[PDB]
Fold Muconate lactonizing enzyme.
Amino acid sequence: HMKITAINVFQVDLPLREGRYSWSNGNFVEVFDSTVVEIETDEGLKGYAECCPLYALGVRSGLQELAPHLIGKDPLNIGEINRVMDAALRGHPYAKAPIDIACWDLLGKATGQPLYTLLGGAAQDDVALYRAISQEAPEIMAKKIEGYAAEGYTKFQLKVGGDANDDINRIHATRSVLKKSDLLVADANTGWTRHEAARVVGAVSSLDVYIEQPCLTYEESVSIRRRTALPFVLDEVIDGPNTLVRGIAEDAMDCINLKISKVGGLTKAKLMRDLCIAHGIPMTIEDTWGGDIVTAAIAHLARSTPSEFTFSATDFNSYGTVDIAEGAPKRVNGRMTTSDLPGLGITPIFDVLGEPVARYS
Amino acid sequence: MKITAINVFQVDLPLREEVFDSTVVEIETDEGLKGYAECCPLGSYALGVRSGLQELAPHLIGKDPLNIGEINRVMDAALRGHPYAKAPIDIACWDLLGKATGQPLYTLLGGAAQDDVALYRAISQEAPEIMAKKIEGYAAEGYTKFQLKVGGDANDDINRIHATRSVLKKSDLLVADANTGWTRHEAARVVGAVSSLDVYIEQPCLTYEESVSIRRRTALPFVLDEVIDGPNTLVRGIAEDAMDCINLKISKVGGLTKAKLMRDLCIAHGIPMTIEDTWGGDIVTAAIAHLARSTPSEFTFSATDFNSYGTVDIAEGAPKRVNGRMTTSDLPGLGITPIFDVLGEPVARYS
Amino acid sequence: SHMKITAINVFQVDLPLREGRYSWSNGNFVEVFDSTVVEIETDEGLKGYAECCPLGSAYLPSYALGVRSGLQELAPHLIGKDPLNIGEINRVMDAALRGHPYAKAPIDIACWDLLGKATGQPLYTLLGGAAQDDVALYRAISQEAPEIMAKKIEGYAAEGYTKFQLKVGGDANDDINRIHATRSVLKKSDLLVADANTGWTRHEAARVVGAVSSLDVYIEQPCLTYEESVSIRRRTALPFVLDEVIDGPNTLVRGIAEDAMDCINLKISKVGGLTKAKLMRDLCIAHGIPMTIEDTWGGDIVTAAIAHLARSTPSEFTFSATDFNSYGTVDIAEGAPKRVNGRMTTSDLPGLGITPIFDVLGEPVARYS
Amino acid sequence: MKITAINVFQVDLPLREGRYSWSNGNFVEVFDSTVVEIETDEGLKGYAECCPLSYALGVRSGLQELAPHLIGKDPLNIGEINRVMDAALRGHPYAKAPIDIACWDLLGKATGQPLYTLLGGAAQDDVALYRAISQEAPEIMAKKIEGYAAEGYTKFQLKVGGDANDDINRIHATRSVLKKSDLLVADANTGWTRHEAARVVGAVSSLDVYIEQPCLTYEESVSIRRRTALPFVLDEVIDGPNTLVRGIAEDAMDCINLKISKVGGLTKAKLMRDLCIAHGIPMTIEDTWGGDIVTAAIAHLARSTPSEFTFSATDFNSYGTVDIAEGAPKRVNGRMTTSDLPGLGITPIFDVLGEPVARYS
Ligand SMILES: [Cl-]
Ligand SMILES: [Cl-]
Ligand SMILES: [Cl-]
Ligand SMILES: [Mg+2]
Ligand SMILES: [Mg+2]
Ligand SMILES: [Mg+2]
Ligand SMILES: [Mg+2]
Ligand SMILES: [Mg+2]
Ligand SMILES: [Mg+2]
Ligand SMILES: [Mg+2]
Ligand SMILES: [Mg+2]
Ligand SMILES: [Mg+2]
Ligand code: NI
Ligand code: NI
C-alpha cells in the first residue's frame, strides 16, 4: 500500500574531537564526509539512514544510479527493494546500505516497533563499547588510551597496519598502560603483507592481544591465523554470507567485525549476524564511520544480539563534535543503550543537514 | 506485552483418500491478541509434541511473545531437542508479531517475493492406465512437478521410477524420494540403474555420511531432507557440496525463525527448497505459504497445500489451491482464525 | 523360560550435596539434584534397577521431567518385551522415540541388571570381564573463587583422591586464576583437568589455553560444538579431552579419524546406556584413547554402573572414574561402591549388585503395566 | 571357575565338490581343521573350531604357545583370557580365536544362555545364506550356481581374481542364469592389480553385481572403489576395528565381510559388527572355512545381527562330508538358524575328532 515518493540526499561534515584520524597505509582524515538519506512516502512517514565511508563521492554517484529506480516502490517490502538495487548496480554497497536502512526505519515507524525487536528481539539492555585509537606515535597512542579508559571504555582497537616495527612499539606501549582486564585489539586494516604480519604477531605473542585483519586477502590472512595462537578477527575480507560461510567451514577466524554499510545494509548484516550466532562467532558490530544516525543502526543491531556474541560495538557519535539527530544512543560507563521508540528511534536535525544536494522523485 | 496463557488443542485430521493427530497451540496475551500455530507429525509422535509443550509452557508465562529471539533462547534452555514442540510456540509468536504490527507474515519474513507459489503432486504406484489418467488430470490443473515414494526393495524401486518417468511429459519434473529407506549398497544400485533418467534423488539414506556417499557417485540432481535439520547441518552440506536442493520442513527444524535463516542461506548458495512440513491442516498450510511467498521463485522448488488432502477445515482465511498453485491473503500474521467448534476444548491449559 | 517385562515403576528422589551447592559453566548451579530411579519388573519376579540424574534442581521444573516424561512415552512399548534381549529393547526404544538418551539409558542399564540377575553374573563380567580390582577416582571441583577451589582440592587430595576435574568455563580471566591456583596446591603426580563444559567461545578458549600452556593440565570440552573445539585443539600442544560432543559411536569415530582428542569422557546416561557406552569403550581401547568413566550426576545406583564399566576397562585406558555417591548426603541403595583411599571397587553380586532403599525412594511417581 | 585342561583335536574336512579353487591358482581338496576344547574344574566344557584357508600347523603351534598360560585362569573373564594371550604371543589371530570362542561357549554354559543372547540379543529368527562358487570354467560355475539356486540359495559369491578375461566371462555366465532377485558378488580375493580390476569392473558395469576385494592392499582397492558405480565390498583388508574405522571414515566400502577367526574371535568380531551396525554397513558374516562348529559360531553372530545389516552368512557344514558335532545349524531352503541351547549349542562327536593331537594341563 505504502509507496516511496521521494529520495533526498544530504551532505554533512563530521569533524573530529581529536582533529585527525589515521590508519593503515598512511591514510588520514580530518573531517569526515557523511551522507544522510531521507526516504519520503505517500503516507507521511519518512525513513532515515546515514553512510560515511573512510568514497563519499561514490556513495552519492551510486545513489544517483539507484534512487530513481526505487520511486513508486514499496519501502516495506525490503527484499524487493534490495532486489531492485542489486539488479541496478554492481557493487556500491555504500550506496545501497542507506536505502536498506531507511526502509527498516520506515518499517519500524509503520509498525510502531523499535528496530531491535524487528531485527529479532532485544537480547541485551545495553552494549559493550570499544574505542578506536588513531595511528600515531606509540607514546601518544598510550596517552589517549589512558584518557578513554578513564571515561569508562574497557575495549580498544588500535589502528596499526603501518610499519611493522612501529606497530610492535605501538602494541607494546598501549598494552602496558591498560589494566589486565581491559581488552586490546590490534587492527591492521589490511596494512601488512604476510612477512610483515608474521614479524608483528611474532613479537607480540606473549601479550594479551587480539590480531585483526592483518592482510588484504582472505588467503593471506589465513596464513597469519595459522601461525599464531592469539585470538584472531576478520573484518574487510568478510563482506557477505558466502565469504562468511567459507571462513566458518575453514576455521579462518575466532570473531568477525561486521560493518553494517560495508556489507550493504541491515538486511545483509542481520543475515551474517544470525549465521555467526549459530556458529558461536562473536562479532564487533560497527560501521565504517558516522554520526548519530550511523550509531543508532549499530546500537539496534547490537541490542538484538546476545551479549555472548557481542564482542563489542562503538559509538561514533561521541568521536565527533557535530550532532545530526536527536534521540540517538549515548554512552554511559563504556556501554551504549537505546530507547524503545519506533525504527531507529531518531529525528534528524535539518538545520545542520542543510539543503539536499540531490533530490529524486 | 506478556504471555498470560498457553492452551493446547487436539484435532483429528482425516484424509480424503488414515487419520492424523494434529495439535493446535493458542497463546494469549494481557492485551487480548492471541497467536496460533499447528504441528502434526507423521503418525505416537503427537504425544511428544504435547509432552514437549507441557515441559516448555511454564517457562513462557510472563515472557514477551514479540521478542522472538528471547522466546527461543528460553525454550532451548528449558528443553533439549523436541523441534516439533518448539516450532508451534515460535510460529504462534510470529503470528502475534503480525497481529501487533498489522503486517502479514510474508512481510515480516523479509517481504513478498512471489504472488503465488508452485505445488507438487505425489504419484501413487498403480496400474499404468490408472496412473496415466490421473496424470492427465494433474496436468490439466496446473501441476508440472511430481514425486514418487521409493526406498523399498531396490529392484522394485528401479522399476517404479522407470514406469513413472515414462508416463510423464518430457518437461515435467520427477523426484524419487527414498525417505531414508536405502542402505549404501541398495542406493548405489538404484541411482546406478536410473543414471540416464531425468530424475531427482531425494534422501536415499538415514544419515548425512551415508547420503554423501551416494552423492559422490551420482551426477543426478540430489536433494536432502531429513538430515538437514538446522542451520548448522545445512552449512556443513553447503560447504561440502552434499546436495543441489533441500526439503525444508518448518516443524522439523523448530519453527519459522530457524526456517527463515535456513531459507536465506539456501538462497545465497543457489539451493532451491521444497517448503513444507511433515503434515498438517489449515494452520500448517498458512505457515508454509507465508514462508514460500517470502522466497523467490528461483529458490522455491515447490510448497505444499496439506489442507487440500484433508476433509476437516480448522481455520478460516487459510491458503487454498487454485490451478496447481497456492497463495495467502495480506491479513495480519498468519491471516487465519481458528474454528473453535472443530478444535474442541483444550486438552491442556498453562497459565 | 522366556522372561517378559510386566511393569515399569519410576521413582523420584532428591539428592542434596555435602558441599551445599555445585556450580559449573554459564553460571549454572544446583543445590539439590532431582534423581530418577527405574525399576523394571518381570513375570519371574526378578527386577532390574537403574538411576538417571541429569544436571538440574529438584526445586525447579528441569531436565529430570524429560527423563520421566520420556519413560512415560517408552514404557508402553516395553511391556511384554524380553528384557534379556537387550539389542531388541534398544531397537524398540529407538523406534518409539527420537532422542531422549537420558530416558533410554536407565531402561538399558536396568535390562543389563536383569541379565546379570538371570545369569548369576556381575555386570563387569557381562561387559567384558574384570580388568581391575579397583579403579582410580577423580573429584569434581565446583566453580568458585580460586582460593576456595584450591582449599577444597587440598582437602580431597588429603582424603586420597589423586585426580581432579575443575569446573571452569566461566569468565576467562577467573578461569586462568582458578587453574593456576589449583595446579599449585597439587603434587606433580596428581592429574588436573580443566573442564570448561562447553563454557567458552573460541576466542575465550584461545586466551585461556595460551595462558596455561606451560602448566601440566588437561583441557576438556572448551566449546559447545565439535568444530569449535577442534579449533582449540589445533592451537594447543596440551593434552586435550572431549566429552559432551562425543555423544555416540559415530561422533567418536569422527573424532578418532580426525585426531580431535587424546582422551574422552564417557557419560553412561548421556550416550544412552551401557550398551552404547560399552561399544564406545571398546573402540577407545582399540585406538589407544583413555577414558574417564562417569555420568552427568547421581547417587549410589549411578555409582554402581560406573564402577562396573570402569572395572571392565584396563587400567591403562581408564584415565579415571568418579564416585558420585560420596558427593551427596542421601543413601539410596545397599551394596553400592564406596570409595576407600581414592579408589572404588564392586562386589561380585549379580548385575549391578545393588538393592534400593525404598524407605528413601518412597512411593513410585509412576507405574506402567 | 577355572581352566583345568585344554585339548586340541585335528580333523580332515573333505569337500562335496572334491575341490575348491580361488584367486592366484589356489585350490584345496581336503581342509585341515582344528577343534579346541577347554575343560574347567566344574566339569563344563567350551568348544571352538578354526580352519583357515600349514595355516593349520600355524594354528596348532600357536596354541602350543598360548595354552599353558591359560591353565588356572578364569575362562568367564573373556577380557583377561585375551590379555593373557596377547602378552604371550604377538598377532596370530587364528591361534587366539578358538580360545576366545571356546570361552564364549563356556560363558553361555555357565549362564544358561545361547550365544546370540550374550552377543547382543536375537535380532533374526533365521538367516540368509550365500553359496561360494569355486573358480572354474564359466559354464561350469554357471551350471553349479543353477543347482545351488534350485536348492534355495538366493545369494552367491563367485571366486574370481584369476585372469581378467576369464573373470569377465565367469561373471557374465553366472549372472545370466540367475533370477533377477538373486544377488551375485564377484569376489576377487585380492587377485587383481588395479589395471586388471579396472578392465573387469568396466566390462561388467551394466550387470547387477557387487565387487569384492579386488586387490591386495586397501589403497589399491579404494582406487577401484572410486572408479565404479557398482556396490563395493571389502574383506581381507578389514582385519580389525582399526582398519574398519579407517574404511568407514574414508568411505572405502558399502559392505564388509567379517571372518570370525581371521579377526581374532567372537569378541573382536562382535565389536566390529556393532560398529558396522552404528554406521549402516551391512556385513557378510562368515569365516575362512570350517565344519559344524565354525557354522554354529557364524549362526549365533548372524542371529544377533538385524536382517538389515546381514548381507548374508554361509553354512560351511553343507560344503563338506564329515559331521563333527551334534546340535549344529542345518540349512533349510537357503536359510539357517540355531537352537536356544546354551553357548554354541553343539556337542562334539569325539568319535570323529579322534584322540587329541595335543593336550595342556
Ligand atoms: Cl502430498
Ligand atoms: Cl531381583
Ligand atoms: Cl577356465
Ligand atoms: Mg602496508
Ligand atoms: Mg577493523
Ligand atoms: Mg482433476
Ligand atoms: Mg530399507
Ligand atoms: Mg522428502
Ligand atoms: Mg561462557
Ligand atoms: Mg566433562
Ligand atoms: Mg592376479
Ligand atoms: Mg571374500
Ligand atoms: Ni560508481
Ligand atoms: Ni520429551
